[PDB]
Amino acid sequence: GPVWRKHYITYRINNYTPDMNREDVDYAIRKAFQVWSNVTPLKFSKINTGMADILVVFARGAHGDDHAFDGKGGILAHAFGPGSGIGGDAHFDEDEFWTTHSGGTNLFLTAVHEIGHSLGLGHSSDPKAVMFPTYKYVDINTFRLSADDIRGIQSLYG
Numbered sequence: 001g002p003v004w005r006k007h008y009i010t011y012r013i014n015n016y017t018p019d020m021n022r023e024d025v026d027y028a029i030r031k032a033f034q035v036w037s038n039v040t041p042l043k044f045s046k047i048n049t050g051m052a053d054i055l056v057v058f059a060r061g062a063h064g065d066d067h068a069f070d071g072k073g074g075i076l077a078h079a080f081g082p083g084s085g086i087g088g089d090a091h092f093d094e095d096e097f098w099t100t101h102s103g104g105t106n107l108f109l110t111a112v113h114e115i116g117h118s119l120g121l122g123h124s125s126d127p128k129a130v131m132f133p134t135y136k137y138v139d140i141n142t143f144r145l146s147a148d149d150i151r152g153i154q155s156l157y158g
């Protein structure tokens with residue numbers, strides 16, 4: 001599949017969920033990017049205006065792509081693989097309740113998974129992998145990619 005063909009990648013937060021403090025959204029997303037820059041040559045920078053490679057959006061129901069959200073539960077988020085335009089973008093279902101902790105749906109953990117897709121990863125069959133497509137809270141303060149995730153991303157970058 002597609003990959004980014006450059007090392008400096010930008011992201012922009014289109015809008016903020018009212019579920020969380022603004023600074024906590026910023027930090028969760030920053031930390032999620034750091035998970036992947038830790039194990040690749042990629043460098044991520046937040047921009048506040050203009051066209052970013054990865055646009056982060058909170059939206060509910062039908063929201064202008066061909067892929068609608070479904071209210072609370074079920075689909076939590078989705079993201080597009082590397083490419084122009086909508087490529088790379090990561091969308092989070094506002095009908096979920098996003099948090100910094102084990103309550104609701106943890107934004108950081110979900111963003112790690114989605115950014116994996118934004119960088120070109122698909123799903124893993126390994127339940128230990130962050131790319132395993134079932135959300136499960138794990139302690140975010142000690143979170144680590146599985147060997148499978150590191151294998152996956154290092155097949156695309158580095």
Ligand SMILES: O=C(CNS(=O)(=O)c1ccc(-c2ccccc2)cc1)NO
Pocket residue numbers: 074075076077078079109110111113114117129130131132133134135136
């Ligand atoms: O795969 C999907 C669509 N399905 S999902 O949104 O139910 C979903 C979303 C995120 C996750 C997830 C997996 C591991 C950690 C955090 C979230 C699981 C299911 N989007 O990427």
Ligand SMILES: [Ca+2]
Pocket residue numbers: 069070071072073074075076093095096
């Ligand atoms: Ca949903």
Ligand SMILES: [Ca+2]
Pocket residue numbers: 052053054055083084085086087088089
């Ligand atoms: Ca994009």
Ligand SMILES: [Ca+2]
Pocket residue numbers: 017018019093094095096097098
């Ligand atoms: Ca919400």
Ligand SMILES: [Zn+2]
Pocket residue numbers: 063065067078091
């Ligand atoms: Zn979408």
Ligand SMILES: [Zn+2]
Pocket residue numbers: 113117123133
């Ligand atoms: Zn997924």
